Structures are given as C-alpha cells and as structure tokens.
C-alpha cells in the first residue's frame, strides 16, 4: 500500500558519489542534469539528477523533495527508480533512473512509422505493467500521459512524475479520480503511441474536448492501428468507469496480443462517434 506523504522512503546519499557529466536544462524547482553515483558496492551508474534551485522558499523545499516521497514507496521495473536524496548539503538533490531516449512522446515524434507493431505493443505493456503495480498500491497518478512515460535505451517503458485531454469524463466533472481514471488515461496514452506523439485532440478547444467526450465522441484510430488495439482504447475509455478493464486485464490483453503476433494483422482529425 501506498502512503500519503522523505528518509522513510528515500536513500540520503553522500554527495562525493555523484558526478555531473551533462546538464539537460531547467526544470520546476531547479536545474536539471545527468551523471554517474557511485554506489556503496562500489559500481558505477548513469542517473538523471534534478537540483532544487538556490534561494529555494520552504513550501518550495517540500513540494520538491515530495516526489522522492511518492517515488521512493515503489520498486519496480516499470516504474522511474529513486536512486536517493541529497538533503544534507546544497544544493538539495533527487537522483533516479538514467532514461538514455527521454520523454516518449517527444522519442516517438522522432521516429514516426519507424517502429514495429510488437515493439510498440512491448512499450505498451511495460507501461501497463507499472500501472497495475501502482494501482494494486492504491495510487491513483493523474497525469499519465506519454509525456510522463520514459523510455531507456532498449526501449523500456517506465512511468514517472510523482490535464484535460488525458482526464477521464467523471474526473473533469467531479474531480472522481480512481485507478479507473487512471485505465482512461492509458487509453489515451495507447492512442499516444500508435500515433507516434500526436497530441491526443489535437488543438481542440478544452471545452470542446469536454463536450465531444461526454457526448461520445472518441479520439479516431490511428493509421494501420491494429482492431485489438483500438478496441482496448474504446474499452479503456467507457463513459462508465465501472465498464473499464483493469490494469491486470490490460497487462493480460497486451501478452496474449504478444504470444499470438498474427492477431496485430487484423487492422482497424476528426472524432468518432461511439
């Protein structure tokens, strides 16, 4: 079970064991980079470090370190690793997973149509395989969305900041968030990638979003998108939340689409009606 929250959950790392190789840019609270940590058995890693900017206010402080937090209750495959913390000396540090091909939708926008089905199916289940994980602690993330997904350098997907286009319908109208809006918001990332980063409705007017959801409409498949994959984003996307396959369904749908790759033969701006 996940718990609502920093050195319960987070390694204090001893500063001498990080390096800085490569600054990336700036981000929230601070700058961000790239390195190597030594780690106490003595090996070498790559990780992504973000620094919390100097001059920081204490809200600001808390808000930042909030993450390691969050990120640092979960251990697996598919989800960003917390490597620790540097709170004892400044600038205050979180150092996680090294991700060598960054943001998947921005990685996908690079290589559009480049990808085999499977591979794309492969990046899909290890998101989903993440997502069953976090749900089955009970965290309900929010912003899934392929901007959120990072992706290594052999193609591994893994979920990580611990958003109206990816909001489930009952979620906008009432701020209703469950893992059901959760396995919404998966749907829209399914459509995400088989479309290569195409930004899920375009330019829409966010009312029109809104709207054109509730009244049924659904974002159109995908070119060559598979029948069993557009069929998962119309399942992931039911107006009743209660009519949403599961994370553990979706991981199982997703294998099976694997084991029997003869099945992604079967093929499928402006919405479509549902």
């Given at each position: ?70 990120m ?21 540090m ?81 701020r ?19 479309s ?49 396959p ?11 689409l ?11 701006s ?5």
């Amino acid at each position: 079970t996940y718990v609502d929250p920093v050195h319960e959950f987070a390694k204090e790392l001893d500063a001498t064991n990080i390096s800085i190789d490569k600054v990336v840019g700036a981000g929230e609270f601070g700058e961000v980079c790239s390195g190597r940590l030594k780690l106490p058995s003595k090996k070498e890693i790559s990780v992504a470090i973000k620094t919390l900017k100097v001059g920081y206010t204490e809200k600001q402080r808390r808000d930042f370190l909030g993450e390691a937090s969050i990120m640092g209750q979960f251990d697996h495959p598919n989800i960003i690793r917390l490597e620790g913390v540097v709170t004892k000396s400044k600038p205050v540090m979180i150092v996680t997973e090294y991700m060598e091909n960054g943001s998947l939708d921005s990685f996908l926008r690079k290589h559009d149509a480049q990808f085999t089905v499977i591979q794309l199916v492969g990046m899909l289940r290890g998101i989903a395989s993440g997502m069953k994980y976090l749900s089955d602690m009970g965290y309900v993330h929010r912003d899934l969305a392929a901007r959120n997904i990072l992706i290594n350098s052999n193609l591994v997907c893994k979920v990580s900041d611990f958003p109206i286009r990816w909001t489930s319908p009952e979620a906008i109208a009432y701020r209703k968030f469950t893992s059901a809006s959760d396995v919404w918001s998966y749907g829209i990332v399914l459509w995400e990638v088989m479309s290569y980063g195409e930004r899920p409705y375009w330019e829409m007017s966010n009312q029109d979003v809104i709207k054109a959801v509730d009244e049924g409409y659904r974002l159109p498949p995908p070119m060559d998108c598979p029948a069993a994959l557009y069929q998962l984003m119309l399942d992931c996307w039911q107006k009743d939340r209660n009519n949403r396959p599961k994370f553990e369904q979706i991981v199982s749908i997703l294998d099976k689409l694997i084991r029997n790759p003869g099945s992604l033969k079967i093929i499928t701006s402006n919405l479509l009606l549902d």
